Design a protein around this ligand. Sequence first.
Ligand SMILES: Nc1nc2c(ncn2[C@@H]2O[C@H](COP(=O)(O)OP(=O)(O)O)[C@@H](O)[C@H]2O)c(=O)[nH]1
Ligand SMILES: [Mg+2]
Length: 311
Amino acid sequence: MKTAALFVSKEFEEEAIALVEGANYKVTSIYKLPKSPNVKFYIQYDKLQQIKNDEEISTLIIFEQLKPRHFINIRRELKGKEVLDKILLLLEIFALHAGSKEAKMQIELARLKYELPIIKETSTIKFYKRRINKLMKELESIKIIPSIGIVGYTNSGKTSLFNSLTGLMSPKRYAIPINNRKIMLVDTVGFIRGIPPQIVDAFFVTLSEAKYSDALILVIDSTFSENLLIETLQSSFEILREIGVSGKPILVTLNKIDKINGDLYKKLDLVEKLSKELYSPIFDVIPISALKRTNLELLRDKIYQLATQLS
Ligand SMILES: Nc1nc2c(ncn2[C@@H]2O[C@H](COP(=O)(O)OP(=O)(O)O)[C@@H](O)[C@H]2O)c(=O)[nH]1
Ligand SMILES: [Mg+2]
C-alpha cells in the first residue's frame, strides 16, 4: 500500500496510529521519539539510512513538529521519499477527506505557509507568498439518494464502521443498497484532539462539510470511563453545533462494546439521556461492535429506517 515508518511517543502511539491510517498509510514500523534528537536529522543517522534504502517503506512519519533544519536534512536524505511531521500528516488527512473548493484552498494555504520557514532556512520565497496572497485573497472573497455522514473522534472506529457497511478514492463516498433503497455513506474527517494552531482553519472548514449530509452517524468509544464518555459527547455535540450542524437526524453508535468488559446498559442509557439533552433530533442510540460484527443488523436496519424517514 503506502507504508510508513512512524516515530511517536508511547503516550501518543495509539492516537498517531489511527491518524496515519486516516492518511491512508500502513504503519510497518514504530519507534519511540529519539531521547537525544539529532541536530541535523532529528532521528538517528543510521536509522535514516536504513529507511532511505528500504524499498518497503515509502514514507517517514514523525509525530512531532519538525524544525525547518530537520526537514531540509531529512528530505535531502530520503531523496524523493516523503517525510510528514505532525502538521503535514494532519493536512494529509484533511486533503483526503475534503471535497469542497474552500477546504482544498485552506489546506493548500496551510501547506504553503508551512514550507516558507523551510525555504527561508535553505525568489522561491517570492513565488510562495504570491500564491499564499492569492489564496487568502480568494478565501476572503468566497467568505462574502440520502447522504449519511460518519463523524466521531479519532480512534472511535469510524473507518471500521464504514468498512463494515460498505464491505470494503478520496474523499470516501460509497453508495450501498439496503433492501430496496440506495444510501450514500460519507467518510467525514474525524474530530481530532490537539490540533496545531496553524491548521485549525483547514480542519474546521474540512469538518464543516459534514453539513452536506442529510443525516449523521456519531461514533463513540464505549470503553471510555463514564466521565470520559460525558466529556466526549459534550465536546462532539459542541463542535457540531459550532460548525453549523442543525436539525440533522443523528444516529449515535456506541462502538467497541466487545472491549467494554463491564456495564453496557448503564453506558448506553447515560449516552442516550445526555445526547438527547445536548441535541435534537437524535434518531436513536445503539450499541455495536464494528470489529466483532455485533449488532450489525441492528445498525443496518436503523440506517434503512433513517433513510426511509428522510425520503
Ligand atoms: N475492539 C474493537 N475495536 C474496534 C472497533 N471498531 C474499530 N476498532 C479498532 O480501533 C481502532 C480505531 O478504528 P477506526 O475504525 O480506524 O477508528 P477511527 O480513527 O475513528 O476511524 C482500529 O484499531 C480499529 O481496528 C470495535 O467495535 N471493537
Ligand atoms: Mg480511520
